[PDB]
Amino acid sequence: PFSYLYEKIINFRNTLYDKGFLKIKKLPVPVISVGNLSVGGSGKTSFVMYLADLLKDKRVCILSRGYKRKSKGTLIVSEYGNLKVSWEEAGDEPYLMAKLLPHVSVVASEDRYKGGLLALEKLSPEVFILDDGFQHRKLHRDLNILLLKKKDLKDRLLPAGNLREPLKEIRRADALVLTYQEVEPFEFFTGKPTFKMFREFCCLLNSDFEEVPFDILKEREVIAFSGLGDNGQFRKVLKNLGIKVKEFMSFPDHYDYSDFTPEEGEIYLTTPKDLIKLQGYENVFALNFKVKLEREEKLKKLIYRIFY
Ligand SMILES: Nc1ncnc2c1ncn2[C@@H]1O[C@H](COP(=O)(O)OP(=O)(O)CP(=O)(O)O)[C@@H](O)[C@H]1O
């Protein structure tokens, strides 16, 4: 215990940034930040991929921390779709983004500015997206996008609750994205430009990352599993879709699946984040989805202003 202190620290830190007492560094191309206020997952990766698709007319580089990765330095994970490292070296989320975005570069660094300077030197990108950037104040962003989910609104600061910062810090966002609307719909009004995000669960991937039809999940009970910030929303999605799940295994976030052995005759259903670690396993599939945003044309205008 407790708790009261973390908040002091975070508050102190934010005030220092608020008043020009800590350095904020600036990259010489536009930078969009995507981030959120809590631990446990908010659809940031998905929103990043959506953004990357909006931005397809530009050379895009994603700057990521690469959580849990086995490497140290600033690292180029992918150049314009050429994967330079294994998923274990990249961290599962940078690798997943690189893999699903064959037109985008991905760099992992603790210090995002440093990652960006390395990318500029080697990759020449026209825009950076920070994949988890909201708390990383020391890097200037031209558009600060905050993702919020319903749960956040009644949550509290770590380590009692899941908030990384108090809710008042919503003030720092240029735009809010209200996520997980297909599972926990909600409304937030703040006066800030606000966009609801929906995941449209439409697709099945085999372990070679090829689309396959659902006919396979028919009259089969599956064993489902994931290791996620929150496995609960995945198991809720499966129920809402009416997928017949006979057993659900809830693994730790970023689980490496070293212990995993499929049982003969069974069908396994999992997420793409998990499937990157199980490539080529037969009879392991992932549920995939499209990301859809309200008022996209409004969002696009907001996004393109940064280039002017
Ligand atoms: N309900 C679901 N169905 C299918 N895949 C899902 C899923 N929920 C999460 N995923 C997968 O896990 C990835 C992580 O998304 P998630 O919403 O869990 O956290 P995140 O993007 O906010 C990053 P972090 O957990 O590190 O904060 C997604 O891109 C997707 O591959």
- The binding site comprises 38-45
> Looking at ligand 1, which residue's alpha carbon is closest to its atom 17?
43
Domain count, the chain: 1
Backbone phi and psi for residue 103, each to the nearest 5 degrees, phi listed first: -105, 0
Range of the domain at 196: 1-308
Token pair for 75: 């690292």
Q: How was this structure determined?
A: X-ray
How far, in Å, CA of 109 to CA of 116, rounded?
Answer: 9
How far, in Å, CA of 148 to CA of 207, rounded?
Answer: 31
> Looking at ligand 1, which residue's alpha carbon is closest to its atom 5?
271
Contact yes or no for 286/196 (Cβ under 8 A): no
Which is the closest atom of ligand 1 to the Cα of 229?
25
Ligand 1 site, CB within 6 A = 41-46, 93, 96, 228-229, 233-234, 237, 271-273, 287, 289
For a ligand 1 pocket test, name from 99, 106, 183, 228 the mutation site with the most ligand atoms within 8 angstroms of its C-beta.
Answer: 228
- The binding site for ATP comprises 38-45
How far, in Å, CA of 39 to CA of 164, rounded?
Answer: 7
